[PDB]
């Protein structure tokens, strides 16, 4: 049965772009969302798209052999960022599966187990830098959260350390990564990106470039001057070659998938955290509850790997996190062939699919009325849920690579956040979320009163 697909007003030529003219575009589409339903047309000066929110139509968008992942316009843009690094190239393009294949192992099992102890080293660190703080001092949480998150990935990927905690102002990296990756969502809305208006901005956007570079260049020239060396991501993206070629990353790919890793190592992981504290101090018999599991595992001055995979709570409340505001909010699909969407939508071959994934967690016919409600309870029980109704990281063969490093990180480190403080809303915080292609709050502070319980000596 064929049905019209409802699309919301139309600004002439410019169609459906002035609705995305928000600080807030995502927000902005759950709302046009709420009033169309299901599935809405949205189309711009330059191509369309189609806005999925039902688990009903996102399941038959997850089927890889009908539906692949397509580049979005924004990935587009960042692509002048990461090139053909493995986010931002096609899933048949050349280097793709070749780097998937090389660097798959960097996030297999024994691998997780090697990145625990610099995992540790880092977290010691946030712990620390809250011990420390004065009776009237505030704790920015999102900011702290990437100079965790941001350190991990510097120091179990590259074995470099950034060491953000040893700065007040952010690492000239981040700034750079964020006027470069606000500038690709930005171009969005520009009618004519190459009017000379924004040659202001193709400007910094170059300079980003040569800063975020810059840093590469010292990451590949510290390990040259190395003997250990040894065996990290950094490694196999250098020495590792594709089973299927036999071929190794160019001297050009490999520049592309650290910049890749360093971005997408930390981004959402960082939101992931302040998100979730954010809704534990908001929910404080949640808190609690997390806080209890935590005193209960967390019995050493260090925690362990198999320690971390016994906060089982503590890794229900990041999925429940997950799932109100996916930090990574949407990805993209095209139609491999021609074909029906739900026996009611018929695509065209190469067709472009929006998976709306906050939306998608909001689908009542799965969860119920209670959606807007934070009770981690939902994921007590992994199967209760529906194939393709949870999909904070994506799908298939384009799925998050570094799912589990960021979910093993977020437990550890939340898990020792509870084990050592106790959380104040000093500022009943007013949720505002920051949108940067990815969703962060911002400007939220907390107060930690430290139940003064010792730390110990960092592992390897
Ligand atoms: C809460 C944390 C994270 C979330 C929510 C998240 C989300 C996602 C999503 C939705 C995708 C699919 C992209 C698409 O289909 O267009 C993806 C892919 C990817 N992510 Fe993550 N991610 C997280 C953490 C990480 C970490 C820690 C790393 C690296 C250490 C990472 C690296 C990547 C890479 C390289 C891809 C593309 C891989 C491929 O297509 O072969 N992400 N992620
Ligand atoms: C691919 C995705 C979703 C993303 O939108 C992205 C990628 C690079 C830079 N900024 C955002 C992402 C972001 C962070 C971690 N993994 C994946
Ligand atoms: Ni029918
Ligand atoms: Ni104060
Ligand atoms: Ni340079
Ligand atoms: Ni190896």
């Known amino acids: 049965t064929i049905k019209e697909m409802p699309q919301p007003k139309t600004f002439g030529e410019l169609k459906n772009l002035p609705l995305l003219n928000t600080d807030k575009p995502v927000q902005a589409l759950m709302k046009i969302a709420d009033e169309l339903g299901e599935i809405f047309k949205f189309e711009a000066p330059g191509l369309v798209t189609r806005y999925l929110s039902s688990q009903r139509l996102i399941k038959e968008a997850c089927d890889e052999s009908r539906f692949d992942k397509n580049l979005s316009q924004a990935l587009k843009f960042v692509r002048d960022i990461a090139g053909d690094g493995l986010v931002t190239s096609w899933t048949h393009e050349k280097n793709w ?3 998937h294949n090389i660097l798959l192992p960097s996030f297999s099992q024994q691998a997780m187990k090697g990145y625990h102890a610099m995992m540790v080293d880092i977290a010691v660190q946030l712990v620390q830098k809250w011990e420390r703080l004065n009776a009237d001092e505030h704790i920015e949480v999102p900011e702290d959260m990437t ?7 510097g120091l179990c990927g590259f074995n470099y350390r950034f060491n953000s905690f040893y700065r007040d102002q952010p690492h000239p990296f981040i700034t750079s990564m964020v006027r470069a990756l606000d500038e690709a969502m930005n171009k969005q809305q520009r009618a004519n990106p190459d009017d000379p208006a924004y040659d ?3 400007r910094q956007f170059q300079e980003d470039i040569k800063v975020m ?5 010292k990451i590949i020239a510290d390990r040259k001057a190395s003997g250990e060396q040894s065996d990290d991501l950094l490694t196999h993206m250098l020495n590792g070659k594709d089973p299927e070629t036999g071929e190794p990353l160019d001297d050009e790919n490999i520049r592309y998938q650290i910049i890749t890793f360093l971005i997408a190592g930390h981004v959402t992981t960082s939101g992931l955290l302040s998100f979730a504290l954010y809704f534990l ?14 005193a209960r595992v967390l019995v050493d001055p260090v925690p362990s790997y198999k320690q971390v995979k016994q906060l089982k ?14 930090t990574a909010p949407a990805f993209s699909l095209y139609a491999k062939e021609d074909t029906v969407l739900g026996g009611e939508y018929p695509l065209e071959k190469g ?4 998976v709306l994934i906050p939306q998608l967690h909001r689908d009542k016919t799965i969860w119920g009325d209670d959606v807007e409600e934070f009770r981690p309870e939902r994921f007590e029980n992994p199967s209760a849920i529906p194939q393709h109704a949870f999909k904070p990281f994506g799908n298939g063969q384009r799925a998050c690579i570094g799912q589990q490093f960021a979910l093993h990180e977020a437990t550890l480190v939340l898990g020792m956040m509870l084990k050592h ?40």
């Open 97 to 99: 599966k070749k780097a």
């Open 147 to 153: 100079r965790l998150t941001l350190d991990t990935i």
């Open 200 to 202: 202001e901005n193709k």
């Open 213 to 217: 570079n810059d840093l590469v260049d």
């Open 281 to 294: 101090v908001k929910n404080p018999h949640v808190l609690q509850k997390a806080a209890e599991e935590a």
């Open 313 to 326: 709570y503590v890794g229900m409340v990041l999925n429940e996190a997950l799932r109100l505001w996916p």
């Open 351 to 354: 067709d472009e699919l929006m």
């Open 421 to 460: 403080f106790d959380f104040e809303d000093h500022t009943n915080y007013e949720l505002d979320i920051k949108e940067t292609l990815t969703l962060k709050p911002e400007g939220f502070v907390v107060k930690a009163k430290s139940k003064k319980i010792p730390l110990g000596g960092i592992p390897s």
